[PDB]
Amino acid sequence: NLDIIGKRIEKIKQEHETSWHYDQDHPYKTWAYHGSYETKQTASSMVNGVVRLLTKPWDIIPMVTQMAMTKEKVDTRTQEPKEGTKKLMKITAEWLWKELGKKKTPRMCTREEFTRKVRSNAALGAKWKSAREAVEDSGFWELVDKERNLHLEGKCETCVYNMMIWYMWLGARFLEFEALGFLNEDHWFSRENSLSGVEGEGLHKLGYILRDVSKKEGGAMYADDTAGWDTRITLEDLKNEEMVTNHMEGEHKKLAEAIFKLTYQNKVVRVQRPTTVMDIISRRDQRGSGQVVTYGLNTFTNMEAQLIRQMEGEGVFKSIQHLTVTEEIAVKNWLVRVGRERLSRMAISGDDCVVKPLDDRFASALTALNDMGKVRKDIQQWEPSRGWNDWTQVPFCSHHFHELIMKDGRVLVVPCRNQDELIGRARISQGAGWSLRETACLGKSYAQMWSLMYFHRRDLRLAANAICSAVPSHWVPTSRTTATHEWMTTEDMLTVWNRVWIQENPWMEDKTPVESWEEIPYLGKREDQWCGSLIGLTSRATWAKNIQTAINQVRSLIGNEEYTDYMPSMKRFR
Ligand SMILES: N#Cc1ccc(Cn2cnc3ccccc32)cc1
Ligand SMILES: [Cl-]
Ligand SMILES: [Zn+2]
Ligand SMILES: [Zn+2]
């Protein structure tokens, strides 16, 4: 315990030797409080202006305006699972890893790969000012090289999480990425490799994936969201995930084993408390890993939980209190005989999941799931799961998927969500100190995503043409903080569409290109109203009629540049 974390604690305590104190009134129970030192400091979402000027009817929708404005979950403990549960998880984790690594090879990620990642402004939780300064400098990689040697010796000095999301100093992110980055970077959780997974599939393929699941014989499709899944990660899960190292070798295996046992399984965290003071607390369980590593581990553990719930549903094991030597061989024979087929009945994306089990016994297979700590959100603990009989209403990654027939007979499966949600997100700009040019480039990014993924929604196709028309044609799309983002490009969007939906799409057998935007269909007007369209309102009819005047107001605010008129792509203006 304190033989592992004590080293990190001493360093921070010594830096603030003139401000150290063990306060009497500390609110931590589940967290172990080690001490505190004095601090004083705090990101409030800002309005992307180009987007708001071109979506005026939504200035009065409070679903949209409210999004732009504006604890006791992390301070919770999970009961140690039963012995029978722990054995099932241990046996399944072991069999899963072996499957994931049949056609993979664990490997250390490089300083070159991590370097190019910070240059492209990748999303990472963090002497030097910017994230790019320490990478260019060499004295950093000495700080990294120091820790790296201490990790090989089985000790840790500077790998302390920051709670503001679990941030960490860039050096720790590198060492984390070096050992475990291979899971993301070499697509371990691809659908080709993992069967349940969807990493790097993109909003335009998920829909086709749910449908392919649907085509299998079985019961309802079950989409149960776990209540605060990161805070429901047990130490037994952290141990089951660490069994990946058993597929590694040499310097890699020891560097991985280190991260797991020194950072994940023994955490140290600095937390600001307004009463301002920085409290140094520790804990062994819960999730705080790298946002990208977390995804792959959450997908791993979630696959494991869902495979076990299917075994409970199919009556492979009777009771979780203790596992018999006949219940072991049966569970093991199950994984070997059908475990692959049962993975292909799922779509898992981190804490998210959609399962089409063999029958509806699954719905009331809640003993193992509740014991693993994977407690379902907003349903009684022992009340059975409400199934879905139609794949076009099943929720997945914040979306639902409409089947949609093109005028030449070919079948698009398009993603969709409440249009008040899409317009509200586009109107937000994360960060301060943005130029009119930068804000405008982010707007083009959303409009190009809308034209590619949400083209079938009338108000988005129109507002997309308007935004692209109000932004100089060459000005490149920019991202605030980084699956597949093909809308990030200056190429002609009808050409992107043809590549994405016709050329590259393996569910389309006829590869005849689409020649104009009119050949690309919309959802029914009621479907479009059901998913939140304003078609039929006077405001939207006025907005659409007088659309050029808004484009010209933005054109006037930016200045005299090279602008294109994209509105003639729609029939009404044509
Ligand atoms: N269900 C339904 C419904 C039927 C008609 C309208 C009127 N409306 C206004 N703008 C439109 C654009 C394209 C199509 C219709 C449009 C609204 C909703
Ligand atoms: Cl219709
Ligand atoms: Zn360390
Ligand atoms: Zn919809």
Burial of 88 (0-12, 13-18, 19+ CB in 10 A): buried
The residues, any chain, with a CB within 8 Å of residue 182's CB and separated by 6 or more, are: 106, 107, 108, 109, 188
CA atoms within 13 A on the CB side of 367: 17
Query: 380 and 339, same structural domain?
Result: yes
Burial of 340 (0-12, 13-18, 19+ CB in 10 A): exposed
DSSP 535: T
62 is a domain residue: no
Count Cβ atoms below 10 Å from residue 32 Cβ, excluding itself. 16
Query: 377 and 295, same structural domain?
Result: yes
Distance separating alpha carbons of residues 420 and 341, to the nearest angstrom? 38
**Residue 209: what residue type?**
I
Indicate the top mutation candidate among 535, 539, 543, 546 to test ligand 1's pocket, ranked by most ligand atoms within 8 A of CB. Answer: 535
Count Cβ atoms below 10 Å from residue 329 Cβ, excluding itself. 10
Signed CA dihedral, 57, 61, 66, 72: sign only? negative
Q: Ligand 1 in contact with 505 (CB < 6 A)?
A: no
**Closest listed residue to residue 296, CA positions, set 149, 126, 166, 182:** 182
**Closest listed residue to residue 226, CA positions, set 354, 73, 375, 385:** 375
Count Cβ atoms below 10 Å from residue 457 Cβ, excluding itself. 26
Contact by Cβ (8 Å): 414, 456: yes
Tell me if residue 396 falls in helix, strand or coil.
strand
Edge-to-edge strands of the sheet including 267-273? 32-38, 277-283, 267-273, 161-163, 166-167
E strand or H helix that includes residue 267: strand 267-273
Please list the helix, strand and coil fractions of the chain in percent, rounded to the nearest 5, in that order.
45, 10, 45
Query: 335 and 406, same structural domain?
Result: no
Q: What CATH code is carried by the domain that includes residue 324?
A: 3.30.70.270
Query: 352 and 211, same structural domain?
Result: yes
Taking CA 171 as the corner, what is the angle to CA 169 and CA 172, rounded to the nearest 5 degrees? 70
Tell me if residue 41 falls in helix, strand or coil.
coil
Structure tokens at 19: 């401000």
Q: Ligand 1 in contact with 431 (CB < 6 A)?
A: no
- 530 CA from centroid of ligand 1 (Å): 12
Measured by CA distance, the residue closest to atom 3 of ligand 1 is: 525
Distance separating alpha carbons of residues 215 and 35, to the nearest angstrom? 57
- 531 CA from centroid of ligand 1 (Å): 13
The residues, any chain, with a CB within 8 Å of residue 429's CB and separated by 6 or more, are: 45, 46, 47, 48, 49, 439, 442, 480
Which domain range does residue 273 map to? 1-38+110-180+235-284
Q: How do strand 277-283 and strand 267-273 relate by DSSP bridges?
A: antiparallel
The helix-helix angle for 458-470 and 419-426 (nearest 10°) equals 20
End-to-end CA distance of the chain: 71
Contact by Cβ (8 Å): 314, 77: no
Distance separating alpha carbons of residues 428 and 70, to the nearest angstrom? 12
Structure tokens at 411: 């079948």
Q: How many domains does the chain have?
A: 3
Q: How do strand 352-355 and strand 32-38 relate by DSSP bridges?
A: unpaired
Where are any strands of DSSP class E within 350-485?
A: 352-355, 400-405, 411-416, 428-429
Q: Ligand 1 in contact with 461 (CB < 6 A)?
A: no
Structure tokens at 469: 């028309």
437 is a domain residue: yes
Could you tell me the CA-to-CA distances from 147 to 51, 137, 242 in Å, in that order? 45, 17, 20
- 422 CA from centroid of ligand 4 (Å): 12
381 is a domain residue: yes
Query: 245 and 167, same structural domain?
Result: yes
Measured by CA distance, the residue closest to atom 12 of ligand 1 is: 535
Distance separating alpha carbons of residues 382 and 364, to the nearest angstrom? 8
**Closest listed residue to residue 224, CA positions, set 416, 370, 87:** 370
The residues, any chain, with a CB within 8 Å of residue 99's CB and separated by 6 or more, are: 194, 339, 340, 343
**Closest listed residue to residue 254, CA positions, set 153, 144, 145:** 153
Contact by Cβ (8 Å): 427, 52: yes
Chain CA centroid to CA 377, Å: 18
Taking CA 89 as the corner, what is the angle to CA 357 and CA 226, rounded to the nearest 5 degrees? 60
- 530 CA from centroid of ligand 2 (Å): 13
- 454 CA from centroid of ligand 1 (Å): 17
**Closest listed residue to residue 312, CA positions, set 258, 361, 379, 276:** 361
359 is a domain residue: yes
Q: Ligand 1 in contact with 535 (CB < 6 A)?
A: yes
Distance separating alpha carbons of residues 70 and 60, to the nearest angstrom? 18
Backbone φ and ψ for 539, nearest 5 degrees, come out as -55, -45
Domain end residue (candidates: 330, 361, 389): 389
48 is a domain residue: no
Distance separating alpha carbons of residues 60 and 164, to the nearest angstrom? 32
Query: 406 and 382, same structural domain?
Result: no
- 338 CA from centroid of ligand 4 (Å): 35
Tell me if residue 287 falls in helix, strand or coil.
coil
134 is a domain residue: yes
Please name which ligand lies nearest the alpha carbon of 525.
Answer: 1
> Rounded to 10 degrees, what is the CA torsion of 345, 184, 418, 374?
60
Distance separating alpha carbons of residues 40 and 287, to the nearest angstrom? 27
Domain end residue (candidates: 370, 389, 408): 389
Distance separating alpha carbons of residues 222 and 363, to the nearest angstrom? 8
Instruction: Compute the residue count for the chain.
Output: 574
Contact by Cβ (8 Å): 230, 351: yes
Method: X-ray
Backbone φ and ψ for 86, nearest 5 degrees, come out as -60, -40
E strand or H helix that includes residue 349: strand 346-349
- The neighbouring-strand residues paired with 396 are 399
Measured by CA distance, the residue closest to atom 16 of ligand 1 is: 535
164 is a domain residue: yes
- Which numbered atom of ligand 1 lies nearest the CA of 544? 10
Helical segments of 188-276, H only? 191-194, 203-214, 235-242, 250-259
- 525 CA from centroid of ligand 2 (Å): 7
CA atoms within 13 A on the CB side of 348: 28
Distance separating alpha carbons of residues 291 and 123, to the nearest angstrom? 8
Structure tokens at 172: 């720790």
72 is a domain residue: no
The residues, any chain, with a CB within 8 Å of residue 75's CB and separated by 6 or more, are: 27, 28, 29, 30, 31
Query: 430 and 361, same structural domain?
Result: no
Query: 509 and 415, same structural domain?
Result: yes
**Residue 485: what residue type?**
H
- The neighbouring-strand residues paired with 162 are 167, 270
Backbone φ and ψ for 430, nearest 5 degrees, come out as -75, 115
Q: Ligand 1 in contact with 458 (CB < 6 A)?
A: yes
Query: 200 and 146, same structural domain?
Result: no
Tell me if residue 563 falls in helix, strand or coil.
coil
Chain CA centroid to CA 414, Å: 20
Query: 360 and 431, same structural domain?
Result: no
Structure tokens at 109: 């990620």
Domain end residue (candidates: 389, 423, 440): 389
Backbone φ and ψ for 296, nearest 5 degrees, come out as -70, -35
Distance separating alpha carbons of residues 130 and 488, to the nearest angstrom? 24
Q: Ligand 1 in contact with 524 (CB < 6 A)?
A: no
Structure tokens at 342: 């049962």
Distance separating alpha carbons of residues 274 and 36, to the nearest angstrom? 12
Q: Ligand 1 in contact with 536 (CB < 6 A)?
A: yes
Q: How do strand 267-273 and strand 161-163 relate by DSSP bridges?
A: parallel
**Closest listed residue to residue 426, CA positions, set 54, 109, 8:** 54
Distance separating alpha carbons of residues 69 and 284, to the nearest angstrom? 35
DSSP 384: P
Q: What CATH code is carried by the domain that includes residue 116?
A: 3.30.70.2840
The helix-helix angle for 250-259 and 139-152 (nearest 10°) equals 90
Query: 265 and 121, same structural domain?
Result: yes
**Residue 371: what residue type?**
D
Q: Ligand 1 in contact with 525 (CB < 6 A)?
A: yes
Count Cβ atoms below 10 Å from residue 500 Cβ, excluding itself. 18
Query: 459 and 343, same structural domain?
Result: no
Distance separating alpha carbons of residues 21 and 23, to the nearest angstrom? 6
Tell me if residue 352 falls in helix, strand or coil.
strand
